[PDB]
Design a protein around this ligand. Structure first.
Ligand SMILES: CCCCCc1ccc(C(=O)N(Cc2ccc(-c3ccc(C(=O)N4CCCCC4)cc3)cc2)C2CCN(Cc3ccccn3)CC2)nc1
Length: 329
């Protein structure tokens, strides 16, 4: 391709990962590629937590292009603080490289057990500058500024468990990934990749909902009240202690999400949001949906949505494009 393509690998229909390198010696790492964050986080050889001892670690002393920064970073997560400091070095994504400012992580203890229990080393954000710590221009913006690509956009063709591989593509939109019309939705903020869509599920509706397209979220998230309502009398239950909302895989009462704009209509049928849990019971499924409240009514269109729809993230035009993903590649 004329474009930069990074192959994506599915992990049990839970999350996907991509590889990238840091340092002019091309130190390898596995990353979460997250449109819902806006920094690049890389664990240091200087990190001595139990979590880091299992990871690929970054050694700045081995890179000729390392440029010291040192500005301290402290961020609060779930299990406490994650801390480190800014560094600059060559970051290689696919066949493109550039010197880039990233967070060199010294203490990961605030990211446990998630961090220890996962097979990735780092997080590479793909959101907007205003979402970032330290006002860092996004990688794709920086690549365009340097004439390494002709459009400041990237696309996601997500891998599908037991079906096909996935690609993150930087710089252009490739026909091999989609079918039918590509429709564009304007961003309502340059922060997350957030757009305004009318949401309908059965009789329940939310006009002009804030919908965040988020590659690092493994579920669809729905306002709690909206969820509670839409599942009433559907033969969907919670078991004393197993997998959250469960249902028979062949349940005909299961609804289709419908999101609309003046530009387009996007639907998510049960086949896209159901996860088989056959090992716990014949014909049993879990609904890959969670209830989550934001200060304003908001849906997170995470991986289940992005598996059905090819997505285009356009910094130049401040928009997200959406098209049906080709079923095979
Ligand atoms: C050395 C690495 C240092 C990482 C430091 C770090 C930690 C957390 C986040 C973060 O907030 N993230 C990034 C993050 C990405 C992926 C994950 C993640 C996803 C899946 C998995 C996973 O595969 N498994 C399966 C194995 C066990 C662990 C879970 C692990 C981690 C966690 C956190 C959030 C997630 C929620 N996002 C959505 C959102 C949008 C709008 C409002 C609120 N929230 C915002 C960004 N950033 C950086």
């Amino acid at each position: 391709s004329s474009n930069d393509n990074i192959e994506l690998v599915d992990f049990q229909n839970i999350m996907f990962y991509g590889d990238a390198e840091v340092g002019d010696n091309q130190q390898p790492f596995t990353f979460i590629l997250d449109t819902g964050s806006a920094n690049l986080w890389v664990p240091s050889v200087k990190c001595t937590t139990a979590g880091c001892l299992t990871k690929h670690l970054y050694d700045s002393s081995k890179s000729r292009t390392y440029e010291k920064d040192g500005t301290k970073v402290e961020m609060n997560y779930v299990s406490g603080t994650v801390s480190g400091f800014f560094s600059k070095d060559l970051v290689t994504v696919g066949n493109l490289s550039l010197p880039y400012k990233f967070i060199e992580v010294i203490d990961t203890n605030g990211f446990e057990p998630t961090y220890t229990a996962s097979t990735f080393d780092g997080i590479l954000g793909l959101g907007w500058k205003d979402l970032s710590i330290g006002s860092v221009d996004p990688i794709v913006v920086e690549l365009k500024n340097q004439n390494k690509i002709e459009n400041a956009l990237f696309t996601f063709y997500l891998p599908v468990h037991d079906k096909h591989t996935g690609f993150l593509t930087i710089g252009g939109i490739e026909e091999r990934f989609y079918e039918g019309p590509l429709t564009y939705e304007k961003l309502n903020h340059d922060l997350y990749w957030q757009i305004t869509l009318d949401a309908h599920v059965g009789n329940i509706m939310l006009e002009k909902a804030n919908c965040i397209v988020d590659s690092g979220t493994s579920a669809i998230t729905v306002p709690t009240d909206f969820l509670n309502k839409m599942l009433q009398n559907l033969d969907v239950i919670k078991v004393p202690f197993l997998p959250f909302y469960v249902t028979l895989c062949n349940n005909s009462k299961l609804p289709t999400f419908e999101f609309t704009s003046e530009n387009g209509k996007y639907t998510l049928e049960p086949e896209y949001y159901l996860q088989h849990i056959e090992d716990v019971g014949p014909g049993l499924c879990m609904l890959n949906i969670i209830g989550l409240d934001f200060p304003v009514p908001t849906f997170i269109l995470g991986d289940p949505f992005m598996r059905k729809y090819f997505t285009v993230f356009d910094y130049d035009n401040h928009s997200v494009g959406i098209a049906l993903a080709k079923k095979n590649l």
